[PDB]
C-alpha cells in the first residue's frame, strides 16, 4: 500500500556540502534515487524553485526538528516518512566528512539509505541490506539494490 500516493515525486537539494563539488553532490543524490526507481513505479525529478516532495539539506547540530546532529561520526543523517510538511525530507550531518570514494562517509550510500525512509521503508535486520541501520561501505561501481530492499519497496508500491 503506498505511503506516497503519487508516482512522480520531486526533490530539491536545498544547500550543499562544500567538501564535494556541486555536480558531484547532484550525481550522488540522483544515483541514489534511481536505485529505488528501478525496483518500483516511482520516478524522481529535481526542481530548482518552489515546493518539492523531498527536500535535501546539510545541517549542523540543532536544525529545527526534534533530532539535533552530533558532530563527526555517531548519527550521519536522518529522514522522515511520507507525509505533509517535513514528511519525505532527508537531512545530512554537515559535520561529517562526505566523499564519493570508499573513505567515510560515501554520500551516495548514505543518501540511498535515507531515501528508503523517505519512501516509507523501515530499518532492516539484514546487514547486507541498504536499510540496515549501520553504515558499511559496499562498493559503488556496479551497486544495485540488495534483495531485501527490493522486497521492501515492492511490498509497499508494487
Ligand atoms: C557511523 N554511524 C552509523 O552507522 C550510525 C550508527 C548508529 C545507529 C543507531 C544509533 C546511533 C548510531 N547509523 C546511522 O547514522 C544511520 C542513521 C539512520 O538510520 N538514518 O536514517 C544511517 C546510516 C545507515 C547511513
Ligand atoms: Ca554525526
Ligand atoms: Zn533533521
Ligand atoms: Zn535509517
From Swiss-Prot:
Q: Which residues form the active site?
A: 114
Q: Where does Zn(2+) 2 bind?
A: 113, 117, 123
| Residues bound to Ca(2+) 2 | 70-71, 73, 75, 93, 96
Q: Which residues are glycosylated?
A: 8, 100, 142
The positions annotated for binding Ca(2+) 1 are 53, 85, 87, 89
Expression by tissue: Neutrophils.
Record: residues binding Zn(2+) 1:
63, 65, 78, 91
Q: Where in the cell is it found?
A: Cytoplasmic granule; Secreted, Extracellular space, Extracellular matrix
Record text about domains: The conserved cysteine present in the cysteine-switch motif binds the catalytic zinc ion, thus inhibiting the enzyme. The dissociation of the cysteine from the zinc ion upon the activation-peptide release activates the enzyme.
- Role description: Can degrade fibrillar type I, II, and III collagens.
Family statement drawn from the similarity comment of this UniProt entry = Belongs to the peptidase M10A family.
Q: What is this protein called?
A: Neutrophil collagenase
Amino acid at each position: 500500500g503506498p505511503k506516497w500516493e503519487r508516482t512522480n515525486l520531486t526533490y530539491r537539494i536545498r544547500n550543499y556540502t562544500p567538501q564535494l563539488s556541486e555536480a558531484e553532490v547532484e550525481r550522488a543524490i540522483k544515483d541514489a534515487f534511481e536505485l529505488w526507481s528501478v525496483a518500483s513505479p516511482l520516478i524522481f525529478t529535481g526542481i530548482s524553485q518552489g515546493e518539492a516532495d523531498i527536500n535535501i539539506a546539510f545541517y549542523q547540530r540543532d536544525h529545527g526538528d526534534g533530532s539535533p546532529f552530533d558532530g563527526p561520526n555517531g548519527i550521519l543523517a536522518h529522514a522522515f516518512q511520507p507525509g505533509q510538511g517535513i514528511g519525505g525530507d532527508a537531512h545530512f550531518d554537515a559535520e561529517e566528512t562526505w566523499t564519493n570514494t570508499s573513505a567515510n562517509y560515501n554520500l551516495f550510500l548514505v543518501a540511498a539509505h535515507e531515501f528508503g525512509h523517505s519512501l516509507g521503508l523501515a530499518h532492516s535486520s539484514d546487514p547486507g541490506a541498504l536499510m540496515y541501520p549501520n553504515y558499511a561501505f559496499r562498493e559503488t561501481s556496479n551497486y544495485s539494490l540488495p534483495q531485501d530492499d527490493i522486497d521492501g519497496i515492492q511490498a509497499i508500491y508494487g
